[PDB]
RNA sequence: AAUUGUUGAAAGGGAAGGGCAUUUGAUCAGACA
RNA sequence: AAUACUGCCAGCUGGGACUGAGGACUGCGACGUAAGUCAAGGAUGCUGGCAUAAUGGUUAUAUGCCGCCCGUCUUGAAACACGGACCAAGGAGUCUAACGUCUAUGCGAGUGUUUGGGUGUAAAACCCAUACGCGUAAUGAAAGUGAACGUAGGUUGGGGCCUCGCAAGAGGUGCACAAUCGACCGAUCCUGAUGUCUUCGGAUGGAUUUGAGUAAGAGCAUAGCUGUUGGGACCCGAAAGAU
RNA sequence: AAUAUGUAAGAAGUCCUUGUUACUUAAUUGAACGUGGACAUUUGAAUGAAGAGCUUUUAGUGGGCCAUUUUUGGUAAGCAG
RNA sequence: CCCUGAAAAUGGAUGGCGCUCAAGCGUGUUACCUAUACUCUACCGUCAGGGUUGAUAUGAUGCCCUGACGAGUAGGCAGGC
């Protein structure tokens, strides 16, 4: 031979798994974050777009929704850690949402099903944006820091 | 204190045992109430600088 | 074959009963401590409207961490340092205050800063630094029967039987303390205070007695 | 052998294990035994007392060989007799019929007294005795026959 | 295999000493004292504020 | 770092297998490994090191210093136990029964033993019959009997035999040894 | 091999070469499945 | 009344960083009326990106910080101390005689077949009688003498074993080893019985002397590392002398 | 004086009884070695003890230099002891 | 505290730039920076303490748990290439 061959060889059977001890126990959000409140959002396609807060969804993400009508936002998904959350809010009292969860977002155009559910809590929300003035027109505005704003001074 | 070492032994056994006779290092103070009647403190300081000579 | 349920009902009933004696013994101890500290407060507050001074007992207990360095240091108080166990920078042991002792002490200030501790870093040095010699082999506390099985002997069977034990100075504060491994603590956490640590305490350095401010440092160390 | 040899191990130090002090030189204490009664003479009062000058008569032409004569002691002496024939003879311990032990044919010169043979009678041709090497033997019923 | 402080770990903290459940739950680390109203002889206040 | 107080890393000192190469040998020491491990009997933790030690400590338990050690009083019928080879003694003349085990017996010794109505037991017999090593007599040998340790320790006043390689007068009998050629020892 | 010619790439404000680390350029293994 | 300061709580709570060793179960606990549950003897859950030079390795370059020429002898070298332009290939603790400690192996009061003979498939292996060598006696310059008062002694520690006790412990025996007191043999100095070819003989009991001794043998042979000595003696090196 | 340094802090201990001899006393007097007997770990301070003891054989080394303190010669020295 | 006393040879040194209610001197209070040290974890090697021949698979100088330690010339030894 070229090489004289172990005299021991490693079981190739294969162990399994000490029973780990760590529950999925469920997240609480951080108290700026309350249904109907505008976020800001930080990063990603609609970065620097605000937004209303809909529902909180067990995946842990967010439930927004521009309105679609307004800045082109739609019902969609985002992250609670990619969010600056404002202090303003519109009572979302009257806007559906149960129908919404992980897998409503499921991968599987456009279903006909989310057009029409995008304009039943759009037409919801601003019913009651517009009991505000102005906030109409902020909300197809984007977010950009101006020369001289420190966010660690800022209040959102 | 070996002679006295008997004793104590003999003396306290044939008594109901508890002795205790090794020696032991000088144990810091108990507490204590030192009183002020007939001895208020008399106030020091420190004094000048003389020379006497 | 029994035992299945049977002999694991035998102990665990029993381990129970252990338990039982340890909180029926560590409640007495906080009744014990309370009171004797109670004492002190009113004896102080007695005297003075009674007219007198109410001198404390000397204290009877005292920890000591070493400060300097490993080299360059004299045969003589090289050697005590070795008996006090304290081998290394920053570790740190209790010793029993006697004259016997107190001019081992004395033999050591320049390298070690020392005095008074209280039950709370008693308390927080066994719970997280506190080993035990067995067999040598440095074992970390972390159940209450590590120390039974062998200060059981003489009393404590329990991690506060232990912090009782020294606290106290109590009759077996030799075997109680050195079943303790020296402590390892860190670096300070605030820093020293101090800006050149090699003096006196008295002399705004970081050496010898310091006596109730052992603590503040201590609790930094841990 | 030579891989085992240390000087293996010592190849790539640049002393090979001699110092770069005091180094490996021909001759330091002078060659052989020089020096003996001078730098030397700590080693040799000491692991060898009694070395240095006379003592005794000479002896020309001394033929070892006129001084020959092995010593056995009573200690033994029952083993020149073939272990076969010898418990035969232990047991009936007789005059009449005692084993006759020709030393000198099994190559000693004297009999000494080394300690304890059993009270069996045997009779010790022999060159030499001891006092005592005789006497033993006649308290168990022995003699010695003096030969050459 | 791997040592877990006691003072953070409420867990550990139980596996030795079970005081520490009453002594949370008595609040005890925040114990009201009997209040007294004990006050000092002038000897002693005067050589305090003496000089 | 750490003020050492002892020399670290240090090894132990003693041996902890035999050196030998011997594969008879090496299974004695699995029995008596394994019977010293699961007896909590002392004589299986003597008798494992023993069978480690060097053939300088092993001398031979003579045949006749056995006989001597069964006079002893209540030991005639205890099993004596060498662990080493044991030799034969035509000086004792009688010789009494019992039961050497060893690690070997020479041609005379067992011959002498077996002679006298007795056993040889090699050293696993031993173990079968005697697990605890129940009513055994272990000798040792006489380490000192050495010619070698004769040598070690010489010096001035010593009295403790030169090494020297012809002896006689002429050799290492004068100066330094009488008080007549400079001195003595 | 020292040393040399050509060709190719690259760096070079009083030497060259090295350590830790990363940019960029070139080159490469494995690993998905 | 408050507050400050100092201290404590096995009072609550936010942000940030690094780690995730282990691999069925087994422990100590914790919460529950309970069933079960848990953060209690070491990370899992969910979601996405690429499946490639994306990550990673090698390499050149650049940039931050750091980096004196190595070897030697020396208290101290980067040294204004020596060798070294560069490459290849040679290039230095050997072998032998005779030894110390140690270890392995054989056999063991003995041990060593190998001068030799036998013999052979022929410098091998196989076999062997007589000696010899070392050991099993010492001590004296020598003439010489030559190791049991005694269970081969007494004492004190001794592992182990034996006997009692559930056990803790108590006795019993106690090898090796060590300490000590003796006894034994030779030297030396005393002592000088019974006898006697009247000077030969030296029993006996003794002595702050002495010995590389006896006191139920440990040795012989092969081998190996280290070490010793003589040899060209780790390698190169005089000025000289000689024929 | 300070600092430094000898011894001691028990089981190889302590107490009773009364054995040996040629030393020794006026003397069974004493000395020395003993048999028999009484008392256990608070059995005679503290702290430590990754144990303690023991033997054999062999390397290198045997140019030393510095610092605080004490200190000799020298005016001194990066001098010499 | 400052000034005078205060004189040497290439051009040059609070380390440099520079600094004057200091970036100077004495002293106090905090915060902050960073060693191969300290604390915790991981891995390597060393030393030690334990566990494990029970067959019917693979190493018994092996396997498994555990703790502590790691400077090095001359020099020793070891295990390897
Ligand atoms: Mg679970
Ligand atoms: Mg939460
Ligand atoms: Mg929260
Ligand atoms: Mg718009
Ligand atoms: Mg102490
Ligand atoms: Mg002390
Ligand atoms: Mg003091
Ligand atoms: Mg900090
Ligand atoms: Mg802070
Ligand atoms: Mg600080
Ligand atoms: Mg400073
Ligand atoms: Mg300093
Ligand atoms: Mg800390
Ligand atoms: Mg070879
Ligand atoms: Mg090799
Ligand atoms: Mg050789
Ligand atoms: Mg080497
Ligand atoms: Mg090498
Ligand atoms: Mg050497
Ligand atoms: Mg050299
Ligand atoms: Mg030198
Ligand atoms: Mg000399
Ligand atoms: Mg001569
Ligand atoms: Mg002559
Ligand atoms: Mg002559
Ligand atoms: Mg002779
Ligand atoms: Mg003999
Ligand atoms: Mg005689
Ligand atoms: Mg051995
Ligand atoms: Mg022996
Ligand atoms: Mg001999
Ligand atoms: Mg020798
Ligand atoms: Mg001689
Ligand atoms: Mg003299
Ligand atoms: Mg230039
Ligand atoms: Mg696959
Ligand atoms: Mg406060
Ligand atoms: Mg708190
Ligand atoms: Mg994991
Ligand atoms: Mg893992
Ligand atoms: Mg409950
Ligand atoms: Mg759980
Ligand atoms: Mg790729
Ligand atoms: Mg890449
Ligand atoms: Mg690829
Ligand atoms: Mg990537
Ligand atoms: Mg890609
Ligand atoms: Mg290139
Ligand atoms: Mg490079
Ligand atoms: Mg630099
Ligand atoms: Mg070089
Ligand atoms: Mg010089
Ligand atoms: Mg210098
Ligand atoms: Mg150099
Ligand atoms: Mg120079
Ligand atoms: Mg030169
Ligand atoms: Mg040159
Ligand atoms: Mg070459
Ligand atoms: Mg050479
Ligand atoms: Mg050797
Ligand atoms: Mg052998
Ligand atoms: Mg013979
Ligand atoms: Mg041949
Ligand atoms: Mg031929
Ligand atoms: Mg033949
Ligand atoms: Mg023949
Ligand atoms: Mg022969
Ligand atoms: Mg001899
Ligand atoms: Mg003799
Ligand atoms: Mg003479
Ligand atoms: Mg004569
Ligand atoms: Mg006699
Ligand atoms: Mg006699
Ligand atoms: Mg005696
Ligand atoms: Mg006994
Ligand atoms: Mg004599
Ligand atoms: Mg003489
Ligand atoms: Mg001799
Ligand atoms: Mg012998
Ligand atoms: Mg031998
Ligand atoms: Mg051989
Ligand atoms: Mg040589
Ligand atoms: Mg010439
Ligand atoms: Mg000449
Ligand atoms: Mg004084
Ligand atoms: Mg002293
Ligand atoms: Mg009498
Ligand atoms: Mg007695
Ligand atoms: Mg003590
Ligand atoms: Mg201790
Ligand atoms: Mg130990
Ligand atoms: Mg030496
Ligand atoms: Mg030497
Ligand atoms: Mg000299
Ligand atoms: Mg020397
Ligand atoms: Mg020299
Ligand atoms: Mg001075
Ligand atoms: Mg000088
Ligand atoms: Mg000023
Ligand atoms: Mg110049
Ligand atoms: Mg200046
Ligand atoms: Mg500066
Ligand atoms: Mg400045
Ligand atoms: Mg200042
Ligand atoms: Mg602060
Ligand atoms: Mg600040
Ligand atoms: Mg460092
Ligand atoms: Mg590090
Ligand atoms: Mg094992
Ligand atoms: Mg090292
Ligand atoms: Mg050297
Ligand atoms: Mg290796
Ligand atoms: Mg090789």
């Given at each position: 031979?070229?090489?004289?061959?172990?005299?021991?060889?490693?079981?190739?059977?294969?162990?399994?798994?000490?029973?780990?001890?760590?529950?999925?126990?469920?997240?609480?959000?951080?108290?700026?974050?309350?249904?109907?409140?505008?976020?800001?959002?930080?990063?990603?396609?609609?970065?620097?777009?605000?937004?209303?807060?809909?529902?909180?969804?067990?995946?842990?993400?967010?439930?927004?929704?521009?309105?679609?009508?307004?800045?082109?936002?739609?019902?969609?998904?985002?992250?609670?850690?990619?969010?600056?959350?404002?202090?303003?809010?519109?009572?979302?009292?009257?806007?559906?949402?149960?129908?919404?969860?992980?897998?409503?977002?499921?991968?599987?155009?456009?279903?006909?099903?989310?057009?029409?559910?995008?304009?039943?809590?759009?037409?919801?929300?601003?019913?009651?944006?517009?009991?505000?003035?102005?906030?109409?027109q902020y909300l197809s505005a984007s977010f950009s820091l101006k020369n001289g704003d420190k966010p660690h001074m800022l209040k959102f | 204190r070996v002679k006295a070492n008997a004793a104590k032994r003999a003396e306290a056994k044939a008594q109901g045992v508890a002795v205790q006779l090794k020696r032991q290092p000088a144990q810091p103070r108990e507490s204590r109430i030192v009183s002020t009647e007939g001895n208020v403190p008399q106030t020091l300081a420190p004094v000048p600088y003389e020379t006497f000579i | 074959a029994e035992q299945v349920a049977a002999e694991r009902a035998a102990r665990k009933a029993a381990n129970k009963e252990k338990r039982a004696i340890i909180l029926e013994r560590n409640a007495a101890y906080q009744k014990e401590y309370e009171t004797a500290e109670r004492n002190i407060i009113q004896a102080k507050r007695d005297a003075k409207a009674?007219?007198?001074?109410?001198?404390?007992?000397?204290?009877?207990?005292?920890?000591?961490?070493?400060?300097?360095?490993?080299?360059?240091?004299?045969?003589?108080?090289?050697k005590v340092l070795q008996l006090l166990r304290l081998t290394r920078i920053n570790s740190g042991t209790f010793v029993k205050v006697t004259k016997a002792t107190l001019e081992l002490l004395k033999l050591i200030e320049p390298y070690v800063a020392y005095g008074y501790p209280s039950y709370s870093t008693i308390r927080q040095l066994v719970y997280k630094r506190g080993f035990g010699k067995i067999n040598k082999q440095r074992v970390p506390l972390s159940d209450?029967?590590?120390?039974?099985?062998?200060?059981?002997?003489?009393?404590?069977?329990?991690?506060?039987?232990?912090?009782?034990?020294?606290?106290?100075?109590?009759?077996?504060?030799?075997?109680?303390?050195?079943?303790?491994?020296?402590?390892?603590?860190?670096?300070?956490?605030?820093?020293?205070?101090?800006?050149?640590?090699?003096?006196?305490?008295?002399?705004?350095?970081?050496?010898?007695?310091?006596?109730?401010?052992?603590?503040?440092?201590?609790?930094?160390?841990? | 052998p030579s891989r085992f040899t240390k000087t293996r191990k010592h190849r790539g130090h640049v002393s090979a294990g001699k110092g770069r002090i005091g180094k490996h030189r021909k001759h330091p204490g002078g060659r052989g035994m020089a020096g003996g009664q001078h730098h030397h003479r700590i080693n040799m009062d000491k692991y060898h007392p009694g070395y240095f000058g006379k003592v005794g008569m000479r002896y020309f032409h001394k033929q070892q060989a006129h001084f020959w004569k092995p010593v056995l002691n009573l200690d033994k002496l029952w083993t020149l007799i073939p272990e076969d024939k010898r418990d035969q003879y232990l047991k009936s311990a007789?005059?009449?019929?005692?084993?006759?032990?020709?030393?000198?044919?099994?190559?000693?010169?004297?009999?000494l007294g080394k300690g304890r043979i059993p009270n069996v009678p045997v009779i010790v041709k022999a060159r030499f005795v001891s006092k005592l090497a005789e006497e033993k033997i006649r308290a168990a019923?022995?003699?010695?026959?003096?030969?050459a | 295999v791997l040592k877990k402080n006691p003072l953070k770990?409420?867990?550990?903290?139980?596996?030795?000493?079970?005081?520490?459940?009453?002594?949370?739950?008595?609040?005890?680390?925040?114990?009201?004292?009997?209040?007294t109203g004990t006050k000092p002889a002038a000897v002693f206040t005067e050589t305090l504020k003496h000089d | 770092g750490i003020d050492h107080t002892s020399k670290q890393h240090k090894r132990s000192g003693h041996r902890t297998a035999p050196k030998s190469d011997n594969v008879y040998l090496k299974l004695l020491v699995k029995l008596y490994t394994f019977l010293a491990r699961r007896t909590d009997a002392p004589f299986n933790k003597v008798v494992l090191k023993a069978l480690f030690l060097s053939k300088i400590n092993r001398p031979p338990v003579s045949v006749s210093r056995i006989a001597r050690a069964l006079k002893q009083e209540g030991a005639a019928n205890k099993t004596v136990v060498v662990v080493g080879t044991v030799t034969?003694?035509?000086?004792?003349?009688?010789?009494?029964?019992?039961?050497?085990?060893?690690?070997?017996?020479?041609?005379?010794?067992?011959?002498?033993?077996?002679?006298?109505?007795?056993?040889?037991?090699?050293?696993?017999?031993?173990?079968?019959?005697?697990?605890?090593?129940?009513?055994?007599?272990?000798?040792?040998?006489?380490?000192?009997?050495?010619?070698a340790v004769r040598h070690f320790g010489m010096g001035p006043h010593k009295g403790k035999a030169p090494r020297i390689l012809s002896t006689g007068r002429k050799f290492e009998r004068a100066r330094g040894r009488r008080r007549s050629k400079g001195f003595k020892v």
């Open positions: 031979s070229a090489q004289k061959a172990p005299k021991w060889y490693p079981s190739e059977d294969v162990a399994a798994l000490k029973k780990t001890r760590k529950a999925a126990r469920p997240q609480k959000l951080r108290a700026s974050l309350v249904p109907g409140t505008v976020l800001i959002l930080l990063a990603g396609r609609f970065r620097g777009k605000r937004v209303v807060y809909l529902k909180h969804l067990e995946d842990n993400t967010l439930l927004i929704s521009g309105p679609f009508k307004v800045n082109g936002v739609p019902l969609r998904r985002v992250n609670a850690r990619y969010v600056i959350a404002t202090s303003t809010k519109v009572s979302v009292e009257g806007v559906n949402v149960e129908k919404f969860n992980v897998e409503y977002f499921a991968k599987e155009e456009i279903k006909a099903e989310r057009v029409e559910d995008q304009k039943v809590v759009d037409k919801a929300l601003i019913a009651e944006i517009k009991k505000t003035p102005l906030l109409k | - | 009674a007219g007198s001074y109410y001198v404390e007992a000397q204290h009877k207990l005292v920890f000591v961490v070493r400060i300097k360095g490993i080299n360059k240091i004299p045969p003589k108080p090289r209450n029967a590590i120390i039974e099985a062998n200060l059981g002997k003489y009393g404590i069977l329990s991690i506060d039987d232990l912090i009782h034990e020294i606290i106290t100075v109590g009759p077996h504060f030799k075997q109680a303390n050195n079943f303790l491994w020296p402590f390892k603590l860190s670096n300070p956490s605030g820093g020293w205070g101090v800006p050149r640590k090699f003096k006196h305490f008295i002399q705004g350095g970081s050496f010898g007695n310091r006596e109730e401010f052992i603590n503040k440092l201590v609790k930094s160390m841990n | 007789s005059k009449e019929t005692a084993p006759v032990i020709d030393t000198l044919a099994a190559g000693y010169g004297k009999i019923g022995g003699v010695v026959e003096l030969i | 770990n409420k867990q550990v903290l139980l596996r030795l000493n079970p005081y520490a459940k009453v002594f949370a739950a008595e609040k005890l680390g925040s114990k009201k004292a009997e209040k | 034969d003694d035509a000086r004792i003349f009688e010789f009494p029964k019992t039961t050497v085990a060893a690690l070997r017996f020479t041609a005379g010794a067992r011959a002498k033993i077996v002679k006298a109505g007795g056993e040889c037991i090699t050293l696993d017999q031993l173990a079968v019959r005697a697990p605890k090593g129940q009513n055994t007599l272990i000798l040792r040998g006489p380490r000192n009997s050495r010619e």
